[PDB]
């Protein structure tokens, strides 16, 4: 159950990552990915190429973004892997000067929160406004602005069981918070000095945290302009943190007409409450816990040297920690990439670290996650 | 069908208190957004009050902003516009129009037939 | 504040004949726009919503155009009932939802 938010007021080079949401088997039907992650701002090119060739009929994720504001896509298509077949993605974006291809090389509590991008396109007519409502790591609602029939629209197997009530309420606050956000980016070229000629963000998020006692852990809600931090909403959910100057006009105006009021409201209230049933209704697969799948590989480059890689496959929720230690410690000196969405609701990670090719055997990595039961432990052995 | 139900007009002297009541007949005024238009009447229209339909959000013109109080009862169905302080220009007769969303825009749609409000001495 | 601006004030046009009603706003609204026929002694209606779209029921001889900042409300054919005054009004910024000083229609005879 959505809120209505009725109260108007950086660059990151994106991540390239092509993986397989399976190991990759030569003729085996097997789906190729592009997450690109940690980029901003939100426009960005990515087409998934197959011998040079574009790929057509590909499927891509809604747009969200991570605690830091930055955004993040999957762009998967179904395919079939072979010998002969080369598989890149073409990604270009501001940061890059150009076009950035990536090989596939083979060897390579509970929350309910809603996310909101309103992106303004000054000649490309009204802002292209999408949002999506998660619950803890998962998807099941999303509205884009674009969409034929602009429509609160489910994307989880147990959320369509609602009835017109929950979708109708839901459009009429989305179509409100679109309208809402769209005043929000009009003032902040105002309060700036912003030509009409560039396309600026105002991402916003808010939710409800639940720990185990089912009452409210704590309250968010946070505005983001341009990709940093613009003015968040305390724990106390009585006051406001502003990160600006202009973000400190802003707060004033929040806090003499007591906005927060009705966010504790519905965050103390009406926010866990829904969790909660999200919780009943979607039990099968948010309160679920698959425990990773982990193998180690090694690959040298060199006759006394190699990059040992401990791989973790197909878990969730997706926070999990993995690194590197000798002996059983290496914080340092050690690669680890963004945690990878497989596009079927599960996540896959990997670690590496350099070695000497002797004493392999004392280097082990760590796999600890809240649907492991017991601490573990693996190294390399053939 | 889908009414909206004034009341509450009459006269009340410069500096009085009044509460309107507009019934909503068919439709729940917990889901839409009630809002209060006047008119003086022989002018044109003014926007006086909006209470946002979930969250509760009220929004008042600059004129009557924190002498009017404008709410809505789930329970009967009812929106309420409690005027205070009523001055000579406060003359007018008061429409409760519903209100509906689409994407990029909103209008008011359902309205009710608008009692009238005389102030004077 | 968007100061709406309906042009002209009031207008006589015999029956038959095409009516056009200009509504400009003081600042760059895009397309939201709305139009409300409301008869003397009456409550208001809808006719136009989303800057062109006309209202579910309201008869096809009315006509909306939105261009930049200016916005025109078009009757194909004059008619007896249509006689009323017809209202623009902005949701782009509700809080004030502003409205036009009204226009005034009447048949010429």
């Known amino acids: 159950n959505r809120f209505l938010g009725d109260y108007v007021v950086i660059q990151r080079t994106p991540k390239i990552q092509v993986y397989s949401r399976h190991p990759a088997e030569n003729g085996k039907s097997n789906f190729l990915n592009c997450y690109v992650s940690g980029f901003h701002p939100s426009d960005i090119e990515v087409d998934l190429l197959k011998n040079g060739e574009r790929i057509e009929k590909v499927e891509h994720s809604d747009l969200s973004f991570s605690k830091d504001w930055s955004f993040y896509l999957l762009y998967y298509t179904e395919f079939t892997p072979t010998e002969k077949d080369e598989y890149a993605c073409r990604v270009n974006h501001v940061t890059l000067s150009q076009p950035k291809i990536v090989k596939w090389d083979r060897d390579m509590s509970h929350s309910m929160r809603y996310f909101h991008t309103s992106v303004s396109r000054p000649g490309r007519g009204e802002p292209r406004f999408i949002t999506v409502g998660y619950v803890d790591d998962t998807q099941f609602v999303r509205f884009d602005s674009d969409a034929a029939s602009p429509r609160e629209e489910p994307r989880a197997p147990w959320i369509e069981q609602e009835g017109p009530e929950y979708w109708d309420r839901n459009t009429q606050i989305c179509k409100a918070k679109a309208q809402t956000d769209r005043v929000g980016l009009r003032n902040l070229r105002g309060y700036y000095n912003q030509s009409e000629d560039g396309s600026h963000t105002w991402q916003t998020m808010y939710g409800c945290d639940m720990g185990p006692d089912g009452r409210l852990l704590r309250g968010y809600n946070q505005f983001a302009y341009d990709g940093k931090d613009y003015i968040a909403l305390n724990e106390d959910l009585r006051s406001w943190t502003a990160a600006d100057t202009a973000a400190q006009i802003t707060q004033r105006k929040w806090e003499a007409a007591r906005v927060a009021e009705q966010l504790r409201a519905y965050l103390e209230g009406e926010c866990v409450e829904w969790l909660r049933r999200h919780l009943e209704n979607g039990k099968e697969t948010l309160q679920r816990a698959d425990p990773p799948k982990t193998h180690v590989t090694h690959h040298p480059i060199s006759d006394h040297e190699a990059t040992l890689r401990c791989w973790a496959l197909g878990f969730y929720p997706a926070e999990i920690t993995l690194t590197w230690q000798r002996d059983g410690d290496q914080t340092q000196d050690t690669e680890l990439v963004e945690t990878r969405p497989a596009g079927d609701g599960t996540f896959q990670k990997w670690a590496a670290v350099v070695v000497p090719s002797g004493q392999e055997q004392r280097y082990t990595c760590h796999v600890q996650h809240e649907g492991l039961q017991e601490p573990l432990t693996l190294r390399w052995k053939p | 069908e889908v009414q909206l139900v004034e009341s509450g007009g009459g006269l009340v002297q410069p500096g009085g208190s009044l509460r309107l009541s507009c019934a909503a007949s068919?439709?729940?005024?917990?889901?839409?957004?009630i809002h209060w238009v006047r008119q003086a009447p022989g002018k044109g229209l003014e926007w006086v009050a909006s209470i946002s339909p979930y969250s509760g959000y009220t929004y008042y013109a600059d004129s009557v902003k924190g002498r009017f109080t404008i709410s809505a009862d789930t329970s009967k169905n009812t929106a309420y516009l409690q005027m205070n302080s009523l001055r000579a220009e406060d003359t007018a007769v008061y429409y409760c129009?519903?209100?509906?969303?689409?994407?990029?825009?909103?209008?008011?749609?359902?309205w009710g037939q608008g009692t009238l409000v005389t102030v004077s001495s | 504040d968007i100061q709406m601006t309906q042009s002209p004030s009031s207008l006589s046009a015999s029956v038959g004949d095409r009516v056009t009603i200009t509504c400009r706003a003081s600042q760059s609204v895009s397309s939201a726009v709305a139009w409300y026929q409301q008869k003397p002694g009456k409550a208001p209606k809808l006719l136009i919503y989303s800057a062109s779209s006309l209202y579910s029921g309201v008869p096809s001889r009315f006509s909306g155009s939105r261009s930049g900042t200016d916005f025109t409300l078009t009757i194909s054919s004059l008619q007896p009932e249509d006689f009323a005054t017809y209202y623009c009004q902005q949701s782009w910024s509700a809080y004030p939802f502003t409205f036009g000083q009204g226009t005034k229609v009447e048949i010429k005879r």
């Open positions: 068919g439709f729940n005024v917990s889901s839409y957004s």
């Open positions: 129009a519903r209100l509906i969303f689409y994407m990029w825009s909103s209008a008011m749609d359902y």
